[PDB]
Symmetry: C4
Subunit: 206 residues, 4 copies
């Protein structure tokens, strides 16, 4: 749990995310809870040139290390950490199916039992606000109150979990659920879903 | 036909299945008929860390080896083995197109002559029941009576065959048929199919 | 232009075709014109285990070498060679988009100027006939009279050209055109096409 | 900034573009501003056999080096360079989603805040004209007046930027936006977009 071990894993999550097909338009950013703030990916540097020393520390006050530029989307990473104390890692991306559902401004309903992985019977969609603003941060903090992942309208996805492995896994799972919802929505609307009682049993079970 | 040769092939089937794009949401599980029960993948361990010694033996009574946790979906692997005596290997996954057809709760009709690979003129869709229950197991055992593969509503796919090679091959084939059905269903409904007599000739031919 | 150089290239075309995503359901077969008949891939052996000595020779009379089983789809490879004297190589596959258009039993119209690569202003779709029969062979020979590639209803694609490189390239191009047609057909029907005069200029130009 | 360093990067952009899935039907071509004209990929040679010495120089008058055949699509590369003085690199391809939007003859509207990367609130679609003609060149030069990327009806995409890295990145981004637009258009028409004022804030911000 040294700084450089946490920097290496951030980078491996960047690479793994690209290999899985979630980082298209070379748009993601990844962070971990650390000391009084977080370690996050820098802005501008392509994932493949990233080295341990590129990773930036941002404290609880929002001040970042000297001579390093944190991701341009860092504020809602900080908002996730303060809204969900149990979150230790955050994955953000512009994965295509998720972003496509976020353009319809729809929530993803319980079309598969794996929806319970993010905490309830849906995957919310928070309202649009200009990227990088205080207003975007508030909507994300309210959406993550009772869910571990949220879509952001006209934008993409945020997923948070106890470690980087699980956070990437969740992010990927939401992209599968997003693709299943768009695939069936083109055939029939609305899409058949499992009932709230059925989702309650699955939740107990997990 | 030693235990470790069967453990190696299970693992290679996991890897091959991931490479083919069927194991998204890192959800599949694979088993083989062995002695009085089966060898199956364990729960929790990511496919890439899997070693021969991770594979779990579950006997005819449903008791598993000490200190090892079998997949959480093991019961319907045991149900497949008792419903189809000729089955020696089982592949389960949550492949996207198959799962998308299973959310519409539709059977896949004879839209391509390769539908005959699973035994008849369709790929059934068994009714939803909570994952891991006795009730899910019964529906799978009834669906596999006269078919080698079945969709599971709101869930995914199960495919069984005489060996791991053929079972993976079948599972993959059903994912192609699922994608062909969803692609054409978005254009026209219903989709044109081959007649029962035409399917009967193909069956004789195979 | 030795037998084993032609066997090596067939195999490399199998591999390249799989890498491109055209050989799903491990269904393709490839042949080259040779002596009085052709060299073709064998039936049963998975592409990755294929060695030079697996390749089968079939003469002008349809007799194959002793102890080797040619692809189960060899007859329409022989039909292509007799219908188009200029063809030296044949690629057959069950590529998804192409097969999906072939289930709608539609021709692909001039939605892109690259349609001219197969000879005219369309990609025909020959009528279904049981795989491996004389009747399937006749429909393919009539469809290839004035086109270098054809869809086969409820089945897949056949493409022929002067060498293996160009034949694979053509096969791949038709799969792109098939995907473009299905993608736009789900939005609007009919799809806008280029006029016959415009296609005539492109043809002169190529 | 030697000739061979610019030739190496063109080639790496070809390869990277293929790896990303934008060069299907082996149709792209890439160029860089150089001396009084440009260096561009040659016609006929498959990307993978390309060596530094294959790259062709075309001067300001449109004369190319002796014994080398420039891409068959070179004229609109020259048109981009004269229409946008700030452009140092050009990427052209027939990427599927982009080409599919270009067959509907539609512009891509502001469905995502990343639309601002090409300069405004849309991605235009220039009218069809036979490939390789003076008329195609004029339409591309008018479309690129106030945008860094344009679709070409019934054809594909052109993207230009200050260097090869950014030009490929832009080209890829437009393919993501194209896929998001076609995915949502199949569900609802019209697709919800961000307002012109909202796009103006994003532009200031970038
Ligand atoms: Zn973002
Ligand atoms: Zn399952
Ligand atoms: Zn076939
Ligand atoms: Zn072009």
């Amino acid at each position: 749990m040294e700084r450089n071990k946490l920097a290496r894993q951030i980078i491996d999550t960047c690479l793994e995310m690209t290999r899985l097909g979630l980082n298209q338009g070379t748009a993601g950013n990844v962070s971990v809870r650390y000391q009084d703030g977080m370690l996050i990916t820098p802005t501008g540097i392509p994932y493949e040139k990233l080295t341990e020393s590129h990773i930036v520390f941002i404290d609880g006050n929002g001040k970042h290390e000297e001579g390093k530029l944190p991701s341009s989307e860092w504020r809602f990473h900080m908002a996730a950490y303060q809204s969900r104390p149990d979150a230790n890692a955050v994955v953000h991306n512009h994965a295509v199916h998720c972003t496509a559902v976020s353009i319809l401004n729809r929530s993803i309903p319980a079309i598969h039992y794996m929806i319970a992985a993010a905490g309830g019977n849906s995957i919310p969609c928070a309202p649009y606000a200009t990227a990088g603003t205080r207003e975007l941060s508030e909507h994300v903090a309210l959406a993550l109150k009772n869910r571990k992942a949220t879509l952001l309208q006209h934008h993409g996805l945020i997923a948070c979990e106890v470690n980087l492995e699980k956070a990437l896994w969740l992010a990927h799972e939401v992209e599968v659920l997003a693709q299943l919802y768009l695939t069936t929505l083109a055939i029939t609307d609305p899409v058949p879903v499992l009932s709230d009682e059925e989702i309650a049993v699955v939740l107990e079970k997990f």
